[PDB]
């Protein structure tokens, strides 16, 4: 049976026998509201580790200053431990410590801002300290986050392997997300334009397109065919630095889409192309 | 039980004790989706060494910008089941992130051997191969590594690389393992429809043709080539991008054939699949 | 024989048997040029742990653009010799390339503690410290780590960082070790010329005086600061960069002194040497 | 006393029991003409390792296609365990067809194409031959070091690469086998080299923010000395060796190539250091 723990000290004691046995611990951090993508993270973790731990915590540090279902899904997925702390279990007094990766975090949505991704980097560093995992699994769906965590892990010599899992998609191609539920039936069928826009970006790249503005314009007009879909951001960037590119061909590129359908923000991304020998 | 390992650090730690105790490590690098031919490399490795390690990594460096990297077949679960049964000690199965945490700026290449034959059709290809293989050898530190003769240019290039760079590994070439009806086993064969799979028998027969032609006393590189390019023309589906007659050692073109081994190398596309096959003929 | 190691991967491989045997690992992080204070941290570590690891690394991140990184004292042969005598099991002595093989893009900071006091005179200094200390704890994975109370603010920050980030290390503060005339032991003391070294006794003397004034009942923080300033100014070779009278836990300014403990923190420049010393005076 | 070995198979036999015992092997590759500099490289290797091995080899792959006594002497005094002194035929029995290069790094400063392929290839071969735990190089040759570090990372070569601070003469001038060629007048003029780096240091400390301004200030400073002609003043990112958009708030490489009469003198300094983000 999956054990549910709430406190840091209870988690540490719960894992002490796995540590004594030299068991590999796989960790999937989440904010709950679990869907099939989360379950594929769990499935990867279980393939590669002896023990699998999922956290559910809605972290206030990644928002501004202002469950039985989930457990059931994790129970059926054969998870060994669910860590579900309250805010007070995680933060009994306010955090004064901040971890950030400013040069990556200030890209894309991170524009020119405070630590847009400080909350994420901080809470993930803390969760790694609590869990002591061997490997941690994240969706490629949240690409910027993943690049940031990798960098943080390398810089800080955190002894955890970071595994990026390919985006899991509903059967019409729409990226799995808990926000998909909000879409009206009409909006849901319009939403298919997002994954189709990525296929179009791939087609254009394979045909030789080399100017990032031309790719952005193509994608914008493509999505625009569906008037219920308004592209808020179409980011074409280096997948390593997340910076703008002077050209596209001969190198891999990240195409990140931020698209509003009705009131709902839909996100998707794909890395297109790959590196040649020097 | 076979241990599946995903990182360079973990793999070296796993192998460190055996290496200290002088145990022989045999290594079979692959791009996965394993077939009878891979399993023969693994058997050779198993009988010849104390410790057997197989790598499964679809190496992006050896795929061109418009080739089949996106659709290259992958099934690690299946691959792993086959390797457990084969009594493999270690499966190294890294993600791209584990093999190439940063974009590679270093390249290993053997331009004389690599720019011709398949490398005319696929520029950069063998630099990708030579690079990943040098890195794999550095990671694993094997005593012996096992490559199939079906990828004959590859094998010659790796032998030369290993020699030139004084890499302390014994390189072992293993005879092309063939399906029931003579076709060279290859993961990419799964792109072929039944019709194409029937049409692909051209390629092994074409090598049997140049076999007896050489045995008949033929002696002109180009007369051997044209006899091949028309013997394969008999099957319409085949769109040869390379028919090559070469010195099996230097891969350079010849003046005459008789009384010297020649290599016949066929890069023949049928449908969406670029089928490769080779034979060394004579002595 | 003490093992001397230079790379992260090498250190983790050297400590793996220890973890396999359930040994407790004591950790003392330093910037080298070791003094008696360092050696007391080591002695304290060895009492409580099976294996003791010292790091020596002059961390560029905790030096500002125009500080003394280039001249900070270094003598690894002398340090190694002292640690061998001290029965240390591991010395981790990386170069900058071994600690930072590529430029860091990550930072750890505790801004509400780190921007006060010494942090007012050295902007960013404590982000440098938090960052390297977090990395070293990841690299070493110790059961306990030992820090001098002489760097009082640093200790407060490291304890807070450890609690905040749930880092599973016990943090031990070690009482300040002093030279015979009361000067806090510090590797930078080697900068002091004879005349500066003689003048430097004004720092511990000023803390004595702070204590004296507090015992007499002085209750006004501004008055205490002003008295300490005048007392130090009697030594023309000493220039106070910070005289801070603070809450010892929050490091914030106080309204009154009596009936609670106060931190008196002095950062005082004598020539090219900025001396630091601290004392917690009174009680709750 | 120091063994001298010439062939690959001999070198491997020599090291095999040391390697079996987990002894740490420190390796110092050279082309001979040894000075105080090389001896520091060797001192470091000996402090950090149980067995020290120095190679002397004038690699043709570095050069265009068209005294072992004094050296081995100093190495015997320095207590080196092994000298590896192959002939061109011992290293390259047949001609090399394999090439290792790090083109993005190799195509900067001195490389503008293939310029550092010779060095990468020989260092890779040497590492394969010796199988060392650590290898020591002078920071004098910065570009080389940065390239070798990248190659080792990219190729997963299990060797620690250690950069050693440039050994310097009485007056600051960088130790070099090229120094012997200066006339005494030229040698007194040559101090302008490290003085130009000090001045580089000074201008950066004073807040100079533009790399062309710095280059022109350094050009002019070296002009003060007519026996000294500056061929190249490279102000670059020490990681990528590329030109910089600005100087302040980031470390900078200042690499000088200066002509003093006939002889080429090189020196460099990384100025500044990384602050927290
Ligand atoms: N029909 C076959 N018979 C024998 N060996 C084969 C056959 N097909 C492939 N092989 C060998 O199995 C090994 C793995 O081949 P695969 O196509 O999986 O990629 P790979 O080239 O081996 O990996 P890399 O190119 O990165 O070394 C190769 O050495 C290949 O020559
Ligand atoms: N006089 C002293 N008595 C007791 N401990 C001291 C004394 N002087 C320094 N220390 C302690 O020795 C340890 C090492 O100090 P050092 O000056 O070498 O830099 P550090 O602060 O230790 O290293 P880092 O800042 O990277 O943590 C510190 O914890 C410091 O507080
Ligand atoms: N003044 C110096 N201080 C420290 N090291 C130096 C100095 N001058 C040269 N060196 C170093 O000595 C080492 C070998 O020098 P040498 O020029 O003899 O061979 P090399 O060209 O480095 O060998 P290879 O390029 O084949 O590796 C190099 O790492 C070089 O940077």
Curated annotation (Swiss-Prot), chain C:
Residues annotated for beta-alanine binding in this entry: 62
Top EC category: ligase
GO molecular function (one): pantoate-beta-alanine ligase activity
Annotated active site: 38 (proton donor)
InterPro entries hit by this protein: Cyt_trans-like, Pantoate_ligase, Pantoate_ligase_C, Rossmann-like_a/b/a_fold
SUPFAM superfamilies from the UniProt entry: Nucleotidylyl transferase (SSF52374)
Catalytic activity, reaction form: (R)-pantoate + beta-alanine + ATP = (R)-pantothenate + AMP + diphosphate + H(+)
One GO location term (cellular component): cytosol
Single Gene Ontology BP annotation: pantothenate biosynthetic process
Further comment: The reaction proceeds by a bi uni uni bi ping pong mechanism.
Stated name of the protein: Pantothenate synthetase
Organism: Brucella melitensis biotype 1 (strain ATCC 23456 / CCUG 17765 / NCTC 10094 / 16M)
């Amino acid at each position: 049976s999956m054990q549910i723990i709430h406190t840091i000290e209870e988690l540490r004691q719960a894992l002490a026998p796995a540590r004594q046995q030299g068991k590999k611990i796989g960790f999937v951090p989440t904010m709950g509201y679990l869907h099939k993508g989360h379950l594929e993270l769990v499935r990867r973790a279980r393939v590669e580790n002896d023990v699998t731990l999922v956290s559910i915590f809605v972290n206030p540090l990644q928002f501004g200053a202002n469950l039985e279902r989930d457990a059931g899904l994790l129970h059926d997925a054969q998870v060994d431990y669910l860590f579900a702390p309250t805010v007070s279990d995680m933060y009994p007094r306010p955090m004064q410590t901040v971890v950030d990766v400013p040069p990556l975090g200030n890209q894309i949505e991170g524009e020119a801002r405070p630590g847009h991704f400080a909350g994420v980097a901080t809470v993930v560093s803390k969760l790694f300290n609590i869990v002591g995992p061997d490997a941690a699994y994240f969706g490629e769906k949240d690409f910027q986050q993943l690049v940031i965590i990798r960098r943080m892990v390398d810089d800080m010599a955190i002894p955890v392997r970071i595994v990026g899992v390919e985006t899991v998609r509903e059967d019409d191609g729409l990226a799995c997300s808990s926000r998909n539920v909000y879409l009206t039936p009409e909006q849901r069928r319009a939403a298919i334009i997002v994954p189709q826009a990525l296929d179009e970006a791939d087609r254009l790249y394979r045909s030789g397109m080399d100017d990032p503005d031309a790719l952005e314009a193509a994608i914008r007009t493509f999505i625009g065919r569906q008037p219920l879909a308004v592209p808020e951001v179409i980011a074409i960037r280096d997948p390593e630095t997340l910076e703008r590119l002077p050209a596209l061909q001969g190198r891999p590129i990240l195409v990140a889409l931020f698209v509003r359908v009705g009131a709902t923000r839909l996100l998707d991304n794909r890395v297109i192309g790959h590196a040649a020998p020097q």
